[PDB]
């Protein structure tokens, strides 16, 4: 072992033992030393948080004025990675202080880690709120901001995806003044585009990191869900084999698992988690009777956790050390039936901040928190006419408010593009009603409206009441357990297109507008309406009914494809070339469309594949809702 690292991280990492020289560690270690950027696919179960501990508290070690800024998603998980690497601070022995920066800390030290803390743990919300407008009070972190460490990559999508690149740029931007540009570490898991996600965000070119320990079994099948997984894993515990089954909403999780615990208790004698007892419990699992919080025999899922590196990931929370194990059952829906007559996926693997409205309100922040200069970029978006439009109003630019309520800031929501958009509120039971989760104007318009059928995370729920006036969407939670609008259209732009074989595939800009028409599921509503102006990717009755069908296969194909919500985007002769269309939802370009761009033909190919060896009868319920082979033979 080379003697460059210190000796004293050198004996604490020789205590618990893990000394090994690994590939994908020492991967990221030496070119993010050498000052490259990475991004890295490993799971939990290799490298876990050490892959970028590591270097972090190198520098730290090497020189005390040096700090590390984290991107987690939660106040949870930020307070986690806190005691998982303050243990490892307390192991080393080395006077470091390192802390979380979030909503739920004590105010009398925060002014503490803002003048002392090392490593600053901090969700994208918390940090774009308050650190960057408040960059002052943080000098001392940025002038020695030498790393950036994100975790959970692929979070960081869509609306969501494209905030936190501006953030990012207005991060880079004040590093930039206090002279301190910092090399970026970002973990993922298995998507399609991990390089080049990690490419985009911060215009960097990072190198991915794709690298016995036994087999892992695999299974295919499906029953004819809970009771089954139950089933299951009684089976597994007569026989005495570690198992684990994977629930994701907190109520059908207190439901399985007081059925399973009664059953079990009697047998054998999340969020709301605090990490006092989460390491109690990884001390019962890995020493004990029932972050390396322990390893598992065998791996139970509860259908397709709707993401790619959702699965990949809870997979891979169970393994053993040159061991074998087992690892998901469907249910009844035709996404989970698809992705289990999909396991073509598995072999190997299966976001635009150009939106000048996003750029627009991170412009009003960024001026507000730090002045500009126009006379240096690295071609990024900074055209200084479009920067000077900016002025003041008579009677949005910006508020040159003298005021304290009012703020830059202010409205501007990262998590989904919250500009103006609806909050839901769960009224099931008055004592803690529920606030839960916000949508876009449009996409309330289509999930959200007044008696629809809302699904949150498989739990059911009713839509009571929409105060479209005020964006506050009413909900009660069903037990017993469609959308449907369409309207006239506009194009604009065509900044990509084709001519090849007849078949044109433009990708551009265009503005549409809105009507909510009906719903299925039977009923009519209507709403007032605004157009929308954004990027899409797009190429007698009879034919209409042709084009129905086209379009039932292509909203039921490119979610999986763009590893999106399946009403994110929305599948419509045209007015526009004469002759007869996905559009983004959200305003303004959000990748949506230029992925689709770029893999059109793999997307084509696998819709041929899809519509030929689909189980039906020239065309499924599931797939299209000898027509099948003249689709096919027309494509
Ligand atoms: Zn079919």
Redesign the pocket.
């Known amino acids: 072992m080379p003697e460059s690292i210190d000796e004293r991280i050198k004996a604490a990492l020789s205590k618990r033992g893990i000394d090994e020289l690994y590939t994908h560690q020492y991967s990221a270690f030496q070119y993010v030393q050498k000052g490259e950027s990475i991004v890295t696919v490993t799971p939990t179960a290799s490298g876990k948080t050490l892959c970028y501990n590591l270097p972090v508290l190198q520098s730290i070690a090497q020189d005390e004025t040096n700090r590390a800024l984290y991107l987690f998603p939660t106040k949870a998980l930020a307070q986690d990675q806190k005691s998982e690497l303050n243990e490892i601070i307390d192991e080393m022995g080395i006077d470091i202080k390192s802390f979380t920066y979030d909503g739920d800390t004590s105010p009398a030290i925060r002014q503490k880690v803002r003048k002392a803390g090392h490593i600053v743990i901090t969700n994208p919300d918390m940090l774009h709120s308050a650190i960057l407008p408040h960059h002052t009070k943080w000098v001392s972190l940025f002038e020695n901001l030498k790393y950036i460490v994100i975790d959970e990559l692929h979070t960081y999508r869509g609306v969501f995806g494209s905030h936190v690149a501006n953030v990012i740029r207005r991060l880079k931007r004040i590093c930039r003044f206090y002279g301190s540009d910092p090399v970026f570490i970002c973990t993922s898991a298995t998507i399609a585009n991990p390089k080049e996600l990690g490419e985009q965000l911060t215009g960097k070119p990072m190198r991915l990191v794709d690298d016995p320990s036994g087999r892992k079994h695999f299974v295919f099948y499906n029953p004819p869900a809970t009771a089954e997984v139950n089933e299951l894993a009684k089976e597994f515990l007569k026989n005495k084999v570690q198992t684990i089954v994977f629930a994701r909403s907190r109520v059908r999780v207190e439901i399985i698992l007081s059925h399973i615990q009664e059953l079990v208790k009697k047998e054998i004698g999340r969020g709301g988690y605090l990490p006092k007892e989460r390491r109690e419990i990884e001390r019962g699992l890995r020493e004990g009777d029932i972050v390396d919080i322990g390893q598992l025999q065998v791996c139970v899922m509860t259908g397709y956790p709707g993401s790619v590196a959702s699965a990949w990931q809870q997979a891979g929370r169970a393994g053993r050390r040159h061991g074998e194990s087992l690892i998901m059952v469907a249910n009844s829906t035709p996404i989970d039936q698809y992705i289990v007559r999909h396991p073509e996926y598995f072999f190997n693997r299966s976001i635009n901040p150009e939106n000048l409205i996003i750029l627009v309100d991170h412009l009003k922040c960024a001026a507000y928190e730090l002045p500009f200069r126009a006379d240096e970029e690295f071609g990024a978006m900074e055209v200084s006419d479009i920067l000077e439009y900016l002025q003041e109003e008579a009677v949005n630019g910006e508020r040159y408010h003298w005021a304290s309520e009012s703020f830059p800031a202010s409205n501007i929501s990262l998590r989904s593009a919250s500009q103006e958009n609806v909050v839901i509120v769960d009224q099931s039971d008055i004592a803690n009603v529920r606030i839960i989760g916000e949508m876009d104007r449009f996409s309330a318009m289509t999930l959200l409206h007044d008696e629809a059928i809302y699904l949150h995370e498989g739990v059911q729920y009713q839509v009571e009441k929409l105060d479209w006036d005020h964006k506050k969407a009413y909900v009660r939670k069903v037990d017993v357990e469609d959308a449907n609008l369409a309207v006239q259209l506009k194009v604009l732009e065509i900044d990509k297109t084709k001519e090849k074989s007849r078949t044109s595939l433009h990708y551009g800009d265009v503005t549409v507008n809105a009507l909510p028409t009906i719903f299925k599921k039977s009923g009519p509503i209507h709403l007032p309406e605004e157009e929308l102006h954004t990027s899409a990717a797009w190429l007698e009755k009879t034919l209409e009914q042709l084009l129905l069908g086209i379009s039932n296969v292509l909203q039921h194909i490119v979610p999986v494809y763009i590893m999106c919500d399946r009403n994110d985007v929305h599948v419509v002769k045209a007015a526009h070339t004469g002759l007869p269309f996905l559009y983004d939802h959200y305003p303004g370009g959000i990748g949506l469309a230029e992925e689709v761009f770029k893999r059109f033909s793999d997307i084509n190919e696998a819709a041929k594949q ?2 030929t060896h ?11 809702g000898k027509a ?1 082979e003249r689709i096919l033979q027309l494509l």
């Open positions: 899809l519509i689909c189980p039906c009868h020239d065309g499924c319920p599931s797939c299209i099948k």
